[PDB]
């Protein structure tokens, strides 16, 4: 079974996600307005990204063991997993009806044309959509969603890490919870290699990250475009 500490970890991660994720998307009215008719969607989406980073930061601080890390290990982990964890948390609004992210209204319904009007090409967007579809098909419990997001943040393989053993032991505690949770709470056939498919998704995110790094560096090459971004977005990415 799931032990008391493992139940504790889950209760924490769920509540931490409930406090950083507003399924009504109310605060979307504060972003620079979307324009759909080049880079005409970069201001609105740069804003949603900047907001999303703040939300991921607030979630990170609630991960049991994250507070034991040094301020520097804390910065390296969040800096490299930011786009990955935002990709993961976006799956909660992604709809397979039309392959898009549906955030309340038609104005905040983003599709492949909107993401391409943010200055990014199909080389990344096609794998991004395929990723969201494969994640949706896993039909994870909200508990599995929060654990995966936590495991993706506390990864010891991220370059610049100092106390790799500490990050490792924090992640193992989250991994074991997840593995136990699938075996105790998740029933067949949905549980079938569900853990291995969840880890595969983490690998698909490493690929999406690496391509993101490239297309971001070319988009932000021209000052006219990094001029449309946010201070936080520029600090996290470059």
């Amino acid at each position: 079974k799931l032990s008391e500490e493992q139940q504790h970890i889950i209760a924490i991660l769920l509540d931490a996600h409930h406090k950083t994720y507003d399924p009504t998307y109310a605060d979307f009215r504060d972003f620079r307005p979307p324009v759909r008719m080049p880079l005409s969607m970069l201001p609105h989406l740069a804003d949603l990204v900047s907001y999303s980073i703040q939300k991921v930061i607030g979630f990170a601080k609630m991960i049991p063991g994250f507070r034991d890390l040094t301020s520097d290990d804390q910065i390296v982990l969040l800096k490299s997993s930011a786009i990955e964890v935002i990709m993961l948390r976006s799956n909660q609004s992604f709809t397979m009806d039309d392959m898009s992210w549906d955030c309340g209204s038609q104005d905040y319904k983003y599709d492949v044309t909107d993401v391409s009007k943010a200055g990014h090409t199909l080389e990344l967007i096609e794998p991004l959509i395929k990723f969201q579809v494969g994640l949706k098909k896993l039909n994870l419990h909200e508990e599995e969603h929060v654990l995966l997001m936590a495991i993706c943040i506390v990864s010891p393989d991220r370059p610049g890490v100092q106390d790799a053993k500490l990050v490792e032991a924090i992640q193992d505690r989250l991994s074991n919870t997840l593995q136990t949770y699938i075996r105790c709470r998740h029933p067949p056939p949905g549980s079938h290699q569900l853990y291995a498919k969840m880890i595969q998704k983490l690998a698909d995110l490493r690929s999406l990250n690496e391509e993101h790094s490239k297309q971001y560096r070319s988009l932000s090459f021209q000052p006219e475009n990094s001029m449309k971004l946010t201070p936080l977005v520029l600090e996290v990415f470059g």
Binding site: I57, K61, S71, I75, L78, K79, P231, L232, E235, V236
Partner: peptide, 10 residues
Amino acid sequence: NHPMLMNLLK
């Protein structure tokens, strides 16, 4: 140097 990031985490 990541002042905004260190602030949000403090």
